[PDB]
Amino acid sequence: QHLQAEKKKMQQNIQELEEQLEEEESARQKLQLEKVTTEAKLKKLEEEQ
Amino acid sequence: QHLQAEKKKMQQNIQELEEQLEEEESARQKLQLEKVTTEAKLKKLEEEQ
């Protein structure tokens, strides 16, 4: 019972970490997309300058 | 043994998930700053042009 109780806590921690990783990874992907768009647009302005 | 192996295997998953969060957050923190800095530069780069 103490093992299953502590073992089940590992699943909760993994599940609690999965929601964080899915949220952090999803937010990181959005930042990379904006950085690529801003970097591409910045290169156009720099080239025109 | 199953609970010990499960709790031990699950513990390794938490370490892998925790390590991914540190690596994901480390890249997100640098990507977020680069995205915001690039976005801020884009707003200023447009004024430069």
Binding site: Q20 | E18, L21, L33, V36, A40, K41, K44, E47, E48
Partner: protein, 49 residues
């Protein structure tokens, strides 16, 4: 607590990231102004001068 403390690091990164957004734009403003404070100045002495 490590995950909770890490949340404060990513949250505090917003301040540094936010400051970089205004710092990058503010720093870039000097380059745009310097490029115009000197180019137009030299031309002002030729056109207005």
């Amino acid at each position: 607590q490590a995950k909770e403390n890490e949340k404060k690091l990513k949250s505090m990164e917003a301040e540094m990231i936010q400051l970089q957004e205004e710092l990058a734009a503010a720093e870039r403003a000097k380059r745009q102004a310097q490029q115009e404070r000197d180019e137009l100045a030299d031309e002002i002495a030729n056109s207005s001068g």
